[PDB]
Structure formats: C-alpha cells, structure tokens
Design a protein around this ligand. Structure first.
Ligand SMILES: CCC(=O)Nc1cc(Nc2cc(NC3CC3)n3ncc(C#N)c3n2)ccc1C
Length: 327
C-alpha cells in the first residue's frame, strides 16, 4: 500500500488542543434570532446553498446569508466550528450569526466584491503581489490553526478593491489536519485540484491549498483562466503533466507507492517539463517577472512535501516591495 505522509509544518497543532477544538461532531450550535434579518436580494447559488444580501434590522448592518441546502449536521458543525476557531484571523471572513427557520442559514460579514471577471483584468503587477500576500496571511493563519481550506479559487476570495480589502470565504469544504488521516479526494473545483487528489493519494495536508494558490497565481500573471484546463479529472492530470512533465509525476508516484488508476496509462504519455516562458506574451508580460516565475515554480510541484509553505511563500522576493510598503 501507499507510503504515509505528514505535514512539514503545524503537524500536531490539533493534537495539542483540547478535544473540543477539532471534535466538531460534538459541537452544539449557538442559534441566533432569525427575525433580526430581512432578505434584500438574491446574490447567487452554491453546491450546498442559496446566497442573499440582507439587513440586520437590530443595527441596520448589511449582511450576507447563506441558506443551506440539505447537508448532514456534522458538515454544518464542521464549517461553523472552523469559522469560530478562525474568527478574528487575518483576512478570514467573519461568521456573524447562525439562524434557523427548518433550514439553517449562516450570516456573514458583507464584502463589497468587484466582479471576479472584471477586477482581475485591471490588476497591476503590484496588485497581484499585494492580494497574493493577503491570501497567504489567511492561509498561514488557518494552517497554523490546524485547518485546510481545500477550496482556494477566485470565487472564494472576496476583494473590495476600493478599500484594498480581501477576505477568504466559503469554508464549507475545510477540514482539520490530523497526522495519519485519509481525506476525501473529491474536493475542490476541477481546475484547482492538486495532483494528490487526481492520483487518489488520501494522506494529504495544508500543502493542497498551496497548489490551488499556484493555479490562481498562474491564471492571474499569464491572463489564462483556467491555467490547467482539463476536460475531466483524468484529463486534468494530463494538462498538468504537459506543463510540469511526466518524469516528476512518475517520480512522485514511485516515492509514495501510489497505485495509479489504469485509465491513466494510455492518456498521460511522455511530456517534457516546459519552461514558463511559453505562457508569456505581449499582453501579459507586464505581470511576469523572474521573481513571479520562481515563486510560481515553487508552488506548482507534484510532491506536496516540496511545495512552499504559506510562511515560506510570504518570504519570497516576489513580495519584498509589499512587505516594505506595509510599514
Ligand atoms: C456566503 C456563501 C459562501 O460561502 N459562498 C458564496 C458566496 C457568494 N457571494 C458573496 C458575495 C459577497 N459580496 C458581493 C455582493 C457584493 N459576499 N460578501 C461576503 C461573502 C461571504 N461569505 C459574500 N459572498 C455567492 C455564492 C457562494 C457559493
């Protein structure tokens, strides 16, 4: 069977906490008063919810309400517990309230978001570095708190551009990291799935989030959304292999003694590792630096153990200007 793996960092953070921190099955939800909110307008939909703008009539605050579709009580408890554990951390969305009426509804802080597919197009080199740094602060925090997001992607990053304000949202797929735990690989949107998910390696960790982040960075600096455009989960690994190369993929599989689905054998083929130069063009060149490419290269690795940590990523030369400016 497959070789075990442990997170390089924050390995035992949960083991050292009282049981109640991570044992979300035991959590008892604190319900607020539904009558404090009036729905204003529909914002959109999710896999597990319908999302509204509302107003708290107690204090006239704008709020966002996520009314949950039918989900197991333990999955709702997990998201609540994680949001409560992370509350106050840098750039983490605030869960304001939990209400029922017998559908349960999560009430969040409102972020005045600029349209994903209209904001990114205006971003400068500096803007990308700045917002990437802000996401890294949220990820280092949640990882340090023993939590994997497992769904990092543009839709889950709210940006109020006028206020240079960012929040990482939608903790519905997030989970506590426990050394030895075999996690569900059916997580994350296709284009952002890490190689560990695609090859069915269950003993993954915080490093999953760093792959997803690298996918985001590539899409932003290269003006290519998505970067890895697979047709399905199988073809998704092929798209990755056409860039990172098949030699390193098969090295990863060997190292962990992973049993590769036989479907893959006739589709992965043989690919060279490509230089990042082939994605640079006259339109995107203003976003691309040696620093950007070095950083990206160090996130997008097959081997989860070799990817930068959040805290290592924050020390990369790509961010030196940002770090100086924040003083
Ligand atoms: C809260 C529901 C969730 O977890 N995901 C989600 C959010 C959403 N839209 C949104 C949209 C906004 N602001 C936009 C209207 C100006 N905000 N602001 C804060 C939050 C939050 N949290 C937010 N979610 C649309 C679809 C889904 C699935």
């Amino acid at each position: 069977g497959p070789v075990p793996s442990r997170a390089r960092v924050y390995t035992d953070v949960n083991t050292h906490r009282p049981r109640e921190y991570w044992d979300y099955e035991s959590h008892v939800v604190e319900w607020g008063n539904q009558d404090d909110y009036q729905l204003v307008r529909k914002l959109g939909r999710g896999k597990y919810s319908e999302v509204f703008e509302a107003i708290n009539i107690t204090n006239n605050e704008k709020v966002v309400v996520k009314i949950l579709k039918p989900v197991k009580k333990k999955k709702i408890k997990r998201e609540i517990k994680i949001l409560e554990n992370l509350r106050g951390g840098p750039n983490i969305i605030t869960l304001a309230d939990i209400v029922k009426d017998r559908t349960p509804a999560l009430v969040f802080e409102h972020v005045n978001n600029t349209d994903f597919k209209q904001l990114y197009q205006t971003l400068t080199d500096y803007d990308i570095r700045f917002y990437m740094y802000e996401i890294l602060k949220a990820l280092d925090y949640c990882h340090s708190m023993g939590i994997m997001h497992r769904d990092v992607k543009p839709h889950n990053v709210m940006i109020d551009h006028e206020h240079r304000k960012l929040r990482l949202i939608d903790w519905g797929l997030a989970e506590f990291y426990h050394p030895g735990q075999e996690y569900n690989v059916r997580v994350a949107s296709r284009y952002f799935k890490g190689p560990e998910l695609l090859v069915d390696y269950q003993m993954y960790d915080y490093s999953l989030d760093m792959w997803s982040l690298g996918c985001m960075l590539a899409s932003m600096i290269f003006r290519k959304e998505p970067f890895f455009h697979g047709h399905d989960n199988y073809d998704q690994l092929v798209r990755i292999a056409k860039v990172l190369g098949t030699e390193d993929l098969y090295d990863y599989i060997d190292k962990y003694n992973i049993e590769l689905d036989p479907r893959f054998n006739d589709i992965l083929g043989r690919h060279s590792r490509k230089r990042w130069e082939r994605f640079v063009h006259s339109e995107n060149q203003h976003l691309v630096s040696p620093e950007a490419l070095d950083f990206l290269d160090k996130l997008l690795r097959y081997d989860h153990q070799s990817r930068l940590t959040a805290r290592e990523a924050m020390e990369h030369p790509y961010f030196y200007t940002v770090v100086k400016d924040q003083a």
